[PDB]
Amino acid sequence: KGEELFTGVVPILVELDGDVNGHKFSVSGEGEGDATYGKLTLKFICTTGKLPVPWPTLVTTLVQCFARYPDHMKQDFFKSAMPEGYVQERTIFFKDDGNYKTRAEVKFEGDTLVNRIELKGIDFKEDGNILGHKLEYNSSFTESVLQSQATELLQKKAQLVSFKIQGIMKRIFMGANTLEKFLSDENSAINDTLKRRMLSEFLLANPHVLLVSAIYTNNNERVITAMSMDSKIAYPNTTLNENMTNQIRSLKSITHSDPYYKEVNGDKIYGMDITLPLMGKNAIGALNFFLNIDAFYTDVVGKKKSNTFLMGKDGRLLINPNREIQDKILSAINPDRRVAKAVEYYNQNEAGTLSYHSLSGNTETFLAIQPFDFFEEKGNHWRWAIGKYVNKSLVFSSHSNVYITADKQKNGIKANFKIRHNIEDGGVQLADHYQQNTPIGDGPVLLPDNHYLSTQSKLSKDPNEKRDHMVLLEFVTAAG
Fold first, then answer.
1. Which residues are (R)-lactate-binding (predicted)?
2. Phi/psi class of residue 127: alpha, beta or left (left: φ > 0; alpha: ψ in -120 to 50)?
3. At CA 457, angle to CA 454 and CA 460, rounded to 5?
4. The CATH number of 9-139+396-479 is which of 2.40.30.10, 1.10.10.2840, 3.90.226.10, 2.40.155.10?
5. Alpha helix ranges (H) inside 206-321
6. Distances, alpha carbon 88 to alpha carbons 286, 339, 364, 408, in Å
7. Cβ(174)–Cβ(166) under 8 Å?
8. Where in the chain is the domain with CATH 2.40.155.10?
9. What is the DSSP letter of 406?
10. Alpha-carbon gap, residue 167 to 414, rounded angstroms
């Protein structure tokens, strides 16, 4: 198949042997490609010293075997040939200057995908744009002064709310203590009308609790429920289940359920049940209440819409400004696998920050997460977290649509596209790309129909790298 190889993160290795008007140069590269989202993160260094040409000119040459091919896209010669290897040849003509001629072998060497390049450049003008180094590098602070301090503030705020949320729950469990004592009293003369009052007060003191129930499994098998509506307490006549009974007889310590939507009063209220056993010496019943998680909305998000969420086990979204995503796993909805670091902070109970990219588009959200236990006695199992995030638009350096057409004669594919390089204090230098891709050996390729690769590239710099270098974030999505 070939596509099977590209199912997660694959290590990238790049090697370039280069001559440009007699100027010989060598470039080595390393990184990782994930062809699920079609993301590549690569770093290149110049092993020969100073690059004779500007780094932006080498991006297209310095791995489309990845790329996010939609399902609509039948599928993808790049992958079909990867069991072995394909040859990517290009000529790149620079307007009013020389041309690059390029030959690339793209072959799996072990588990690492290795791009091995020969590059020849002739007819270039010394003191021109390329050899005279007059091109821009980046997309015309921020990550330091703003991003760090922004995330820094995020955590103090995430801690501040955390305290509050532990406050509410402290009051609720405290009320549940008093009710347990009262309800665990098996005295005949304590009528139900008086149990209903004690149930009502617990609710009245805690409006984050929708519902409460005294369940008895001893001899007078019954359930006394009070439910809090709109300034109204009512007493529904709940019936006992043979499964719920015996399970209550078996309960020994306080527990909770997984969050769910309670289908009550024609409404979907998100929450969990908290069950406390009433006594436990070989178990009169249980005090259970339904914690209304929806009621913490203003406590977590705020009175105004803000970038804050409440997170439960396995990074479930308990509270989130976007209601349509509630009760969904954070890792599930977001592609960037760096989002899994949130659930680790959660489980560790250690506050920390994490960064993740948006889909295959252009946005990086900086997240702070603040775990906390909302019930300390039992213990792991009683932990939430608050995430305060900051979404930022990611300005890319280059964009171009690589129109790829099937060949036939060479059981391969062909493509043509233009790249526009910005000049320092000036205008634009166009590079016409012409691309030929054929396989190395015998075997069935997958000759496509007619489609374009929406490539996107960001060029950053490593502050610690001591040699001429280039770091690269690419987003290669297929569409047509």
1. 320, 356, 359-360
2. left
3. 170
4. 2.40.155.10
5. 244-250, 297-300
6. 70, 34, 32, 16
7. no
8. 9-139+396-479
9. E
10. 64
* Residue 89, phi then psi, degrees to nearest 5: -105, 135
- Residue 360, annotated as binding a ligand: yes
Question: Which method was it determined by?
Answer: X-ray
Note the resolution in Å, 1 decimal. Answer: 2.4
| Tokens linked to 402 | 């690589």
CATH architecture, range 147-163+296-392? 2-Layer Sandwich (3.30)
Residue 356 among known ligand-binding residues: yes
At 387, list the tokens.
């995430």
Q: What is the CA radius of gyration of the chain?
A: 31
Task: Name residue, tokens 């009528």.
Answer: 191
Q: Which long-range contacts (CB under 8 A, 24 or more apart) does 218-223 make?
A: 218/186, 218/283, 218/284, 218/285, 221/245, 222/192
Architecture of the domain made up of 167-294: 2-Layer Sandwich (3.30)
Give the residue from 392, 388, 364, 391 showing the smallest Cα distance to 308: 388
Q: Find how far residue 371's CA is from the centre of its chain.
A: 18
Block residue for tokens 């047509």: 480
Length of the chain: 480
Nearest to 23 by CA among 48, 47, 42, 44: 48
Q: Which residues belong to CATH 3.30.450.20 in the chain?
A: 147-163+296-392, 167-294
Nearest one of 362, 382, 385 to 374, comparing CA atoms:
382
Q: In angstroms, what CA-CA distances link 122 with 52, 308, 356?
A: 13, 56, 42
